[PDB]
Design a protein around this ligand. Structure first.
Ligand SMILES: CC(=O)NCc1ccccc1-n1c(C)nnc1C
Length: 206
């Protein structure tokens, strides 16, 4: 059946849609289709294209209030400017300077503000089940379900550690700590990465 209304969605509303590049883009909802118990959403993008999308691949074109976001919430966030999907890992508190921690689907971790987030319209019941990479999906499942139990390593600037990258352990130095993230300098290539302090990639004991 073709619908005009579905929950709080209405044909002709402004929306974000996921493209095949995995980046998200502004568009208009032009149709809502039911296929059995399933639903699909047709989006005409502002520049290029039409797509027929599942409800976990569209997002509202506004910023969610803080009270609607939980650990595990499925969101689209500004990525450094692209829009990319992720999962809320922390909500604002004193220890993170009132920011949201986002774990992006590709494994990137960043603190963002509410103005950098868009809520996904119809997330999966287990929100991590549409993460493509099984290693990434399993980490997120474990993190979200164990929360607020979060084993982390206490690191300090200047500390020498080994950090995993592409299957091997590299000599590295802690440059800076920002809440639950640590900025690691790899000593061989002298390049930095922000890493979650509960990552098994971090080995201070060697
Ligand atoms: C940069 C970061 O720590 N992201 C968290 C994360 C989120 C999802 C999947 C993997 C990871 N991860 C990476 C990448 N390194 N360790 C872990 C855990």
């Amino acid at each position: 059946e073709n619908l005009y209304f579905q929950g709080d969605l209405i044909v002709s509303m402004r929306i974000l849609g996921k493209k095949r590049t995995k980046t998200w883009h502004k568009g208009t909802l032009i149709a809502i289709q039911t296929v059995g118990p399933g639903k699909k959403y047709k989006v005409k993008f502002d520049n290029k294209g039409k797509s027929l999308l599942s409800g976990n691949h569209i997002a509202y074109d506004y910023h969610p209030p803080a009270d609607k976001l939980y650990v595990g919430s499925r969101v689209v966030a500004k990525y450094k400017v692209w829009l990319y999907a992720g999962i809320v890992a922390e909500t604002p508190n004193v220890k993170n300077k009132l920011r949201f921690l986002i774990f992006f689907d590709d494994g990137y971790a960043s603190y963002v503000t509410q103005s950098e987030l868009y809520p996904i319209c119809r997330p999966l019941k287990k929100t991590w089940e549409d993460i493509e990479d099984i290693s990434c999906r399993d980490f997120i499942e474990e993190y979200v379900t164990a929360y607020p139990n979060r084993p982390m390593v206490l690191l300090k600037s200047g500390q020498l550690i080994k950090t995993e990258w592409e299957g091997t352990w590299w000599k590295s130095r802690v440059e800076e700590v920002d809440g639950s993230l640590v900025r690691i300098l790899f000593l061989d290539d002298k390049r930095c990465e922000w890493i979650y302090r509960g990552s098994t990639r971090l080995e201070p004991m060697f």
